[PDB]
Amino acid sequence: SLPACPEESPLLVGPMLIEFNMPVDLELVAKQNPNVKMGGRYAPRDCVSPHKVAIIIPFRNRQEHLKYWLYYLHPVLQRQQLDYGIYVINQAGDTIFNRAKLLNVGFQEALKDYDYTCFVFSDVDLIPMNDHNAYRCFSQPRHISVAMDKFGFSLPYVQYFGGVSALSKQQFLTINGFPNNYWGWGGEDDDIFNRLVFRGMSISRPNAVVGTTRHIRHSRDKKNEPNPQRFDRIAHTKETMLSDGLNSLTYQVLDVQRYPLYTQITVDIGTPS
Numbered sequence: 181s182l183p184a185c186p187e188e189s190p191l192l193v194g195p196m197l198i199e200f201n202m203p204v205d206l207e208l209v210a211k212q213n214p215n216v217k218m219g220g221r222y223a224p225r226d227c228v229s230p231h232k233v234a235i236i237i238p239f240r241n242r243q244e245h246l247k248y249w250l251y252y253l254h255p256v257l258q259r260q261q262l263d264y265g266i267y268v269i270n271q272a273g274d275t276i277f278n279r280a281k282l283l284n285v286g287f288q289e290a291l292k293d294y295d296y297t298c299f300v301f302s303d304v305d306l307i308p309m310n311d312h313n314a315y316r317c318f319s320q321p322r323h324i325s326v327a328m329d330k331f332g333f334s335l336p337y338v339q340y341f342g343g344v345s346a347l348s349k350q351q352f353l354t355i356n357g358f359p360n361n362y363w364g365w366g367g368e369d370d371d372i373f374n375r376l377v378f379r380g381m382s383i384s385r386p387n388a389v390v391g392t393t394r395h396i397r398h399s400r401d402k403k404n405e406p407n408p409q410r411f412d413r414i415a416h417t418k419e420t421m422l423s424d425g426l427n428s429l430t431y432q433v434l435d436v437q438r439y440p441l442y443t444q445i446t447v448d449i450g451t452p453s
């Protein structure tokens with residue numbers, strides 16, 4: 181007998197000041213966010229949200245970015261009235277990084293906690309400047325980080341689908357999830373765009389002003405060099421997506437930690453096969 185939340189949250193304040201030059205204390209973030217429950221889980225107390233959102237962060241060795249992410253996003257996600265949880269998918273070992281494979285692990289593991297029907301995939305170093313930019317799913321796949329400071333506050337190209345995005349459970353299943361074989365930097369997000377288009381979908385976006393986003397400046401991570409096979413890979417997505425993705429995924433979870441503000445899943449996703 182709780183009523184549905186309003187369709188758009190009345191709590192939103194719009195544009196927000198965001199800065200990355202001060203230290204962050206997660207103990208204090210946790211105290212500032214008392215309604216956030218163990219594992220980084222929150223649903224509103226006064227109404228039922230139709231947005232059951234698992235937020236998935238691909239991760240290795242970005243603890244500092246992550247504290248900023250948690251400081252800024254948690255208050256935003258509560259104002260958006262989402263029934264949500266945060267998952268940091270931490271790649272075990274020190275071999276070449278695989279962003280999209282971690283994202284698939286996150287989808288599949290989050291489903292074991294709770295009946296999530298919406299998946300937001302967010303890089304760790306991207307912070308939204310306007311809480312009108314909704315971190316939940318739409319009737320088409322949603323590209324969220326549309327106007328990043330590092331690309332001059334617009335799309336670097338109209339088919340860009342990197343950074344932060346949201347797919348419903350059904351959208352994600354319809355494309356057989358994300359590719360597993362993009363090792364090292366680049367192109368897995370273009371492949372994901374291809375997948376959506378080949379399954380009859382198009383990209384929904386907020387406007388450039390609501391969609392403004394900050395990227396935390398940082399230097400190159402080691403073990404995530406540009407993948408030189410990326411350009412060939414993206415040219416063949418239509419054929420490869422049929423049998424690469426959810427239906428070809430394995431991994432071994434090494435450790436699950438419930439911290440107050442996030443669940444961290446440490447996972448062995450292997451090396452190129």
Ligand SMILES: CO[C@H]1O[C@H](CO[C@@H]2O[C@H](CO)[C@@H](O)[C@H](O)[C@H]2NC(C)=O)[C@@H](O)[C@H](O)[C@@H]1O
Pocket residue numbers: 336337342365366367368369370410411414
């Ligand atoms: C698909 O190609 C277009 O973008 C590339 C630049 O490379 C992309 O840049 C974005 C933003 O950093 C990354 O998210 C993508 O993974 C990159 N994609 C690839 C394949 O590297 C540009 O050089 C091309 O001319 C196209 O605009």
Ligand SMILES: O=c1ccn([C@@H]2O[C@H](COP(=O)(O)OP(=O)(O)O)[C@@H](O)[C@H]2O)c(=O)[nH]1
Pocket residue numbers: 237238239240241242277279302303304305306365401402403404
């Ligand atoms: O060693 C790494 C490589 C990347 N990532 C994650 O993958 C995302 C994409 O990589 P990157 O930051 O290099 O993109 P860039 O900002 O350089 O274009 C990051 O935001 C992180 O979530 C990470 O955690 N550790």
Ligand SMILES: [Mn+2]
Pocket residue numbers: 305395398
């Ligand atoms: Mn980055």
